[PDB]
Design a protein around this ligand. Structure first.
Ligand SMILES: CC[C@@]1(O)C(=O)OCc2c1cc1n(c2=O)Cc2cc3ccccc3nc2-1
Length: 565
DNA sequence: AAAAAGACTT
DNA sequence: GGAAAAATTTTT
DNA sequence: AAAAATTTTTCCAAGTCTTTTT
C-alpha cells in the first residue's frame, strides 16, 4: 500500500495529532545474578555481594578492559555511586575501589560472549523469533488513521556513564528506569497502555502539542529522554521536509544577508560588529551557534557564540597568506577544529578589538550569545535561526559538486565514487571527522592484492589478443576475425571490472578519516540526491539503503530529475 | 529577561 | 550517528 | 571447513532552539 503523506494537506499549526494509541515502552531485562563459581574478592578474602551491589559491580567488571576505568573522575564518581547501592554490612567493609578484585567477574563475562557466538541454529533461531514478536506488538503505534513505526521502543538498560570527551560525570550510575518514572502520552479516546503488574506510570498525559509517546528524566544530567516515532513517519518527515524548505528559502536572499553582515563590520557598536563577525563564522566557516553550557556538568566544548579567547591566536602572515586566524578548540562531541583562515581586512582588525584587555578564559564575543544572534536572524528572514546555515551550506555544496563532478561518460561505479566525493566535501566542511578504523587499514593491502590480481587476469587477455592478430594476418577468414572479436570483448569485460575495483579502492581510501553519515542523513536535502539519481539512471539503492529509502520515502517519490535546491 | 525545562535535531 | 558487536558472507 | 574480511545491529550523547518557570 504505502501512505503518501506528502500528498496530504499540511497538519494545522500547533496540533500534532488528533488520535494516538500505543502499547507503551519495553523495559530493560531484569538482572540475573552471578553463579557459585564466579566469586568476588575484597582485600583478598571472599565477599558476598547483595543483588543491588552485585549489579553495580558487574557494570565496572565488564569495562575493566577499557583504559578509562583508570581515570580519577571515573573511579571517583563510580565508587561514590556504588556506595549508595550497598548494604551496611558492605558499606562498612568496602572503603575503597582499589582493594576490590573484579578479575573473576570480568573473566566470566568474556566467556559468555564466546559461548554465545557458539550457539545452535535452534536457540539462535528461537531468539531471533522472540525478538520479532516484540517488534510487532511494541514497535508500532497508531497515529491518526495510520500504523507508524516507533524508533527506540526499548528503554536503555542501567549501566555506567561514559559519555564523550573528558566528561565530569563519567563513571556515575545510570539507574534502572522503573514504570514510576515513565510519563505516558496518548489521546483521551485511546486505550491507555497497561503498566507492568503492581505498578503505576508516573503520569498518563494527553498533550497533543507534542510528538512523543513516552518520556522520562534520566539521572546523569537530569535531561528528559523520549520515545519518539521512526524517521519514516509522517510527523518526523514533514518536519525534515520543512527544515529543508527553510534552508531552501535562505537561498533566495542569502547574498542579501551577506551584503549586510559585511558592512555591519563597520558599524558604530561593538555589539553589532560582534554579531556580524560571529555570523561570518557560522556562514563561511560552518561553525555551530555555540550555546552556553553548565561548567562541571558537561565536557568543556564550544561553538561560535561561546568561543573563548584562548581558542584563537592572531597571525598577520603565514605560508604566504594575509590575515590568518588560527582556530583551535574542541567542538561538539569533543571533536577538534583546527583552521588557518585568510579573512577580509576589517574582520582581522575587529577580532583584535574583541580580544583587547581580555584574559584567555574570557569570551571572544561578550555582549553575545545564541539568543541575540537568533533574534536578528529571525528579523532578517521569517523563521531563520543559526543552524539553517549549516543546512544551506551543506546541501548547496552537494548540489554544486555533483554538477562539477559527474560526467555523462562514466560507468555506474565511478559515478557512485563522484557522489561520494561530493558527500566527502560537505563532510569536511561540516567537520564530521573520524578516527581511522581499528588498525584495519591494512585491508587496503588486502584490496590491492585483489586489484593486482585482476591486472594479471587482464594482462593475459592482452597477450591473448596479440596472438589472435598474429593468426588473423596469415590466412584471413571469417573464423579467425570473429575470434579477434571474442578476445576483444574479453579485454573489455575485465577492463570494466578493474575500473570497478580501482574506483572502489579510491573511494575507500579518501573516506579514511572522514564521516559521511551525519551529513547523508542529517544535512543534505534528499531530493538533491534523488534528482541526480533519476538523471544518470543510478538505481537509488546504490546510494540510500532501506532505512534511508524509507526515511527519505518522500523525496524519492515526489521529485523528478529536473529538481533544483 | 534569563534561568531551567522541554522538545526536538545532530 | 560512529565505533564495536555480532551475523554474515569472502577468502584461503 | 575455518580464518577473514564484510554488512549490519547494537551501544550509548550532545547539541539547537522553543516554552516554561522564576
Ligand atoms: C556522531 C554523530 C552524531 O553525534 C551527530 O552529530 O549527529 C547524528 C547523531 C549523532 C549521535 C546520535 N544520534 C545522531 O542522530 C542519535 C543518537 C542516539 C543516542 C542514544 C543514546 C546514546 C547516544 C546517542 N547518540 C546519538
Amino acid at each position: 500500500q504505502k501512505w503518501k503523506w506528502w500528498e496530504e494537506e499540511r497538519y494545522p499549526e500547533g496540533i500534532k495529532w488528533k488520535f494516538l494509541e500505543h502499547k507503551g515502552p519495553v523495559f530493560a531485562p531484569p538482572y540475573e545474578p552471578l553463579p557459585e563459581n564466579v566469586k568476588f574478592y575484597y582485600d583478598g578474602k571472599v565477599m558476598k555481594l547483595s543483588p543491588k551491589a552485585e549489579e553495580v559491580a558487574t557494570f565496572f567488571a565488564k569495562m575493566l578492559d577499557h583504559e578509562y576505568t583508570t581515570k580519577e573522575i571515573f573511579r571517583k564518581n563510580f565508587f561514590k555511586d556504588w556506595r549508595k547501592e550497598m548494604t551496611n554490612e558492605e558499606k562498612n567493609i568496602i572503603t575503597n575501589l582499589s582493594k576490590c578484585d573484579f578479575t573473576q567477574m570480568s573473566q566470566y563475562f568474556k566467556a559468555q560472549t564466546e559461548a554465545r557466538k557458539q550457539m545452535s541454529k535452534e536457540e539462535k533461531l528461537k531468539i531471533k523469533e522472540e525478538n520479532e514478536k516484540l517488534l510487532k506488538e511494541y514497535g508500532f503505534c497508531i497515529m491518526d488513521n495510520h500504523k507508524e513505526r516507533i524508533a527506540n521502543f526499548k528503554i536503555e538498560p542501567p549501566g555506567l556513564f561514559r559519555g564523550r570527551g573528558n566528561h565530569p560525570k563519567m563513571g556515575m550510575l545510570k539507574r534502572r528506569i522503573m514504570p514510576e518514572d515513565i510519563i505516558i502520552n496518548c489521546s483521551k479516546d485511546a486505550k491507555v497502555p497497561s503498566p507492568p503488574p503492581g505498578h503505576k506510570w508516573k503520569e498518563v498525559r494527553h498533550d497533543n502539542k507534542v510528538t512523543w509517546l513516552v518520556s522520562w528524566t534520566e539521572n546523569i544530567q537530569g535531561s528528559i529522554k523520549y520515545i519518539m516515532l521512526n524517521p519514516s513517519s509522517r510527523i518526523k518527515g514533514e518536519k525534515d521536509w520543512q527544515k529543508y524548505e527553510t534552508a531552501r528559502r535562505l537561498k533566495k536572499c542569502v547574498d542579501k544577508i551577506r551584503n549586510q553582515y559585511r558592512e555591519d563590520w563597520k558599524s558604530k557598536e561593538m555589539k553589532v560588529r560582534q554579531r556580524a563577525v560571529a555570523l561570518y563564522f557560522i556562514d563561511k566557516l560552518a561553525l555551530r551557534a555555540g550555546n552556553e553550557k553548565e561548567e562541571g556538568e558537561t565536557a568543556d566544548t564550544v561553538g561560535c557564540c561561546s568561543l573563548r579567547v584562548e581558542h584563537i591566536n592572531l597571525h598577520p602572515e603565514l605560508d604566504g597568506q594575509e590575515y590568518v586566524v588560527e582556530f583551535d578548540f574542541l567542538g561538539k562531541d569533543s571533536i577538534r577544529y583546527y583552521n588557518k583562515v585568510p579573512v577580509e581586512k576589517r574582520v582581522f582588525k575587529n577580532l583584535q578589538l574583541f580580544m583587547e584587555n581580555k584574559q584567555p578564559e574570557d569570551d571572544l564575543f561578550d555582549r553575545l550569545n545564541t539568543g541575540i544572534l537568533n533574534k536578528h536572524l529571525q528579523d532578517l528572514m521569517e523563521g531563520l535561526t543559526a543552524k539553517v546555515f549549516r543546512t544551506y551550506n551543506a546541501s548547496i555544496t552537494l548540489q554544486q559538486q555533483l554538477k562539477e563532478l559527474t560526467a555523462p561518460d562514466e560507468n555506474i561505479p565511478a559515478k557512485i565514487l563522484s557522489y561520494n566525493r561530493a558527500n566527502r566535501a560537505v563532510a569536511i566542511l561540516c567537520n564530521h571527522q573520524r578516527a581511522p578504523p581499528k588498525t584495519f587499514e591494512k585491508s587496503m593491502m588486502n584490496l590491492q592484492t585483489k586489484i593486482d590480481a585482476k591486472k594479471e587476469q587482464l594482462a593475459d587477455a592482452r597477450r591473448d589478443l596479440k596472438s589472435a592478430k598474429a593468426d588473423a594476418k596469415v590466412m584471413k577468414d571469417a573464423k579467425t576475425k570473429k575470434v579477434v572479436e571474442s578476445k576483444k570483448k574479453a579485454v573489455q569485460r575485465l577492463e570494466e571490472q578493474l575500473m570497478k575495483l580501482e574506483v572502489q579502492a579510491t573511494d575507500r581510501e579518501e573516506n579514511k578519516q572522514i564521516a559521511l553519515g551525519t551529513s547523508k542523513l542529517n544535512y543534505l536535502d534528499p531530493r538533491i540526491t534523488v534528482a541526480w539519481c533519476k538523471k544518470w539512471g543510478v538505481p537509488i539503492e546504490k546510494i540510500y539503503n532501506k532505512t534511508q529509502r524509507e526515511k527519505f520515502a518522500w523525496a524519492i517519490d515526489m521529485a523528478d530529475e529536473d529538481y533544483e535546491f
